[PDB]
């Protein structure tokens, strides 16, 4: 029982807290592809895309996934890791995938909270909201497609780990 465990979902849904705790209960080491990328490709998307394009950003992400995926590890992934099929296929072939689920409506509400004081209706408000929800829902369908297991990540982290330990049988 030694395969890495991949955590997928949006960031801000307790991947770090759940990941570390889970690692602690199994004697595994916790790692995070986004930190790996900051360390090896720098702190900005802008520098990588300017130098190597979106395809070179995706390549560095895919290499980070493959580099940290060794036995006895719980791997947190970037919110966009599931966007390319090759990453989804890699994850399923090399270990167990847990989706920390948060409804696309809640993610939209989190974006609003961080960016706008409230929400008075405006002519352009719903259309733009609608576009952002469509993109959130397309990504959600890919989180679901790659997952072996899905846990409600709108629960506190301790309740998630316990359900995963039951769900995955530990
Ligand atoms: Cl994200």
Coordinates of C-alpha atoms and ligand atoms in Angstrom, one line a residue:
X1 CA 0.0 0.0 0.0
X2 CA 2.6 2.5 -1.0
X3 CA 1.4 4.4 -4.0
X4 CA 1.4 8.2 -3.7
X5 CA -1.9 9.8 -2.9
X6 CA -2.9 12.7 -5.2
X7 CA -5.1 15.4 -3.9
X8 CA -7.0 17.4 -6.6
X9 CA -9.4 20.4 -6.4
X10 CA -9.2 24.1 -6.1
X11 CA -6.8 25.8 -3.8
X12 CA -8.3 27.2 -0.5
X13 CA -10.3 24.0 0.2
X14 CA -8.0 22.6 2.8
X15 CA -5.6 20.6 0.6
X16 CA -2.6 21.6 2.7
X17 CA -4.2 20.9 6.2
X18 CA -5.8 17.7 5.0
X19 CA -2.7 16.6 3.1
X20 CA -0.3 17.1 6.0
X21 CA -2.6 15.4 8.5
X22 CA -3.2 12.5 6.1
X23 CA 0.6 12.2 5.6
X24 CA 1.1 12.2 9.4
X25 CA -1.5 9.3 9.8
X26 CA 0.2 7.1 7.2
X27 CA 3.9 7.9 7.9
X28 CA 4.0 9.6 4.4
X29 CA 5.7 12.8 3.4
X30 CA 3.6 15.7 2.2
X31 CA 4.6 17.5 -1.0
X32 CA 2.9 20.2 -3.2
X33 CA 3.4 20.6 -7.0
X34 CA 2.7 24.4 -6.7
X35 CA 5.5 24.9 -4.2
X36 CA 7.8 22.7 -6.3
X37 CA 7.0 25.0 -9.2
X38 CA 7.8 28.2 -7.2
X39 CA 11.1 26.6 -6.2
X40 CA 12.2 25.4 -9.6
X41 CA 10.4 27.9 -12.0
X42 CA 10.1 31.0 -9.8
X43 CA 7.4 32.9 -8.2
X44 CA 5.4 34.2 -11.2
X45 CA 3.4 32.8 -14.0
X46 CA 4.3 35.9 -16.0
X47 CA 8.1 35.0 -16.2
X48 CA 7.5 31.4 -17.3
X49 CA 4.8 32.3 -19.9
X50 CA 6.9 35.1 -21.3
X51 CA 10.0 32.8 -21.6
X52 CA 8.3 29.6 -22.6
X53 CA 4.6 30.1 -23.3
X54 CA 1.5 28.4 -21.9
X55 CA 2.8 25.1 -23.3
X56 CA 6.1 25.6 -21.4
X57 CA 4.1 26.5 -18.2
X58 CA 2.1 23.3 -18.6
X59 CA 5.2 21.3 -19.3
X60 CA 6.9 22.5 -16.1
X61 CA 3.7 21.6 -14.2
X62 CA 3.6 18.1 -15.7
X63 CA 7.3 17.7 -14.9
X64 CA 6.7 18.8 -11.3
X65 CA 3.9 16.2 -11.0
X66 CA 6.1 13.4 -12.2
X67 CA 9.1 14.5 -10.1
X68 CA 7.4 14.6 -6.7
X69 CA 5.2 11.5 -7.2
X70 CA 7.3 8.9 -5.4
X71 CA 6.1 6.2 -2.9
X72 CA 4.9 7.2 0.5
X73 CA 3.8 10.7 -0.4
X74 CA 0.6 12.7 -0.2
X75 CA 0.8 15.1 -3.2
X76 CA -1.2 18.4 -3.3
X77 CA -1.6 19.7 -6.9
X78 CA -2.3 23.1 -8.5
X79 CA -5.9 24.0 -9.1
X80 CA -5.2 23.7 -12.9
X81 CA -3.4 20.3 -12.9
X82 CA -6.4 18.4 -14.1
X83 CA -6.9 20.6 -17.2
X84 CA -4.6 18.5 -19.3
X85 CA -5.5 14.9 -20.0
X86 CA -1.9 13.6 -19.7
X87 CA -1.8 14.8 -16.1
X88 CA -5.2 13.0 -15.3
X89 CA -3.9 9.9 -16.9
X90 CA -0.6 10.0 -15.0
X91 CA -2.3 10.5 -11.7
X92 CA -4.7 7.5 -12.2
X93 CA -1.9 5.3 -13.4
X94 CA 0.6 6.1 -10.5
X95 CA -1.6 6.3 -7.4
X96 CA -4.9 7.1 -5.7
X97 CA -6.7 10.4 -6.5
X98 CA -8.9 12.2 -3.9
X99 CA -11.0 15.2 -5.0
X100 CA -11.6 17.7 -2.3
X101 CA -14.9 19.0 -3.6
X102 CA -16.4 22.5 -3.2
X103 CA -19.3 23.4 -5.4
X104 CA -18.6 25.8 -8.3
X105 CA -21.2 28.2 -6.8
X106 CA -19.2 28.4 -3.6
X107 CA -15.9 29.0 -5.5
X108 CA -17.6 31.8 -7.4
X109 CA -18.9 33.3 -4.1
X110 CA -15.2 33.1 -2.8
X111 CA -14.0 35.1 -5.8
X112 CA -16.7 37.7 -5.2
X113 CA -15.8 38.0 -1.5
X114 CA -12.2 38.7 -2.4
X115 CA -13.0 41.2 -5.1
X116 CA -16.3 43.1 -4.7
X117 CA -17.8 44.6 -1.5
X118 CA -21.3 43.3 -2.3
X119 CA -23.5 42.4 -5.2
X120 CA -26.0 45.0 -6.5
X121 CA -27.4 43.7 -9.8
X122 CA -25.8 45.5 -12.8
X123 CA -26.5 45.1 -16.5
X124 CA -23.2 43.3 -17.1
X125 CA -23.0 41.4 -13.8
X126 CA -24.9 38.2 -14.6
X127 CA -23.3 37.6 -18.0
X128 CA -19.8 37.9 -16.6
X129 CA -20.8 35.8 -13.6
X130 CA -22.2 33.3 -16.0
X131 CA -19.0 33.0 -17.9
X132 CA -17.0 32.5 -14.7
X133 CA -19.4 29.8 -13.6
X134 CA -19.2 28.0 -16.9
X135 CA -15.4 27.8 -16.7
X136 CA -15.7 26.7 -13.0
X137 CA -18.1 23.9 -14.1
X138 CA -15.9 22.7 -16.9
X139 CA -13.0 22.3 -14.5
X140 CA -15.3 20.6 -11.9
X141 CA -16.2 18.0 -14.5
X142 CA -12.4 17.2 -14.9
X143 CA -11.9 17.0 -11.1
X144 CA -14.7 14.5 -11.0
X145 CA -13.4 12.5 -14.0
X146 CA -9.9 12.0 -12.5
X147 CA -11.0 11.2 -9.0
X148 CA -11.1 7.7 -7.4
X149 CA -12.6 9.3 -4.3
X150 CA -14.6 12.5 -3.7
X151 CA -14.9 14.1 -0.2
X152 CA -16.9 17.2 0.8
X153 CA -14.2 19.8 1.4
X154 CA -16.6 22.4 2.7
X155 CA -16.2 20.4 5.9
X156 CA -13.5 21.2 8.4
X157 CA -10.2 19.4 7.7
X158 CA -10.4 16.9 10.6
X159 CA -13.8 15.6 9.4
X160 CA -12.3 15.1 5.9
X161 CA -9.3 13.1 7.0
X162 CA -11.5 10.8 9.0
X163 CA -13.9 10.2 6.2
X164 CA -11.0 9.6 3.8
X165 CA -9.5 7.1 6.3
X166 CA -12.8 5.3 6.2
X167 CA -13.6 5.9 2.5
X168 CA -10.1 4.6 1.4
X169 CA -9.9 2.1 4.2
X170 CA -7.2 3.0 6.7
Ligands
LIG1 CL1 -7.5 27.0 -7.8

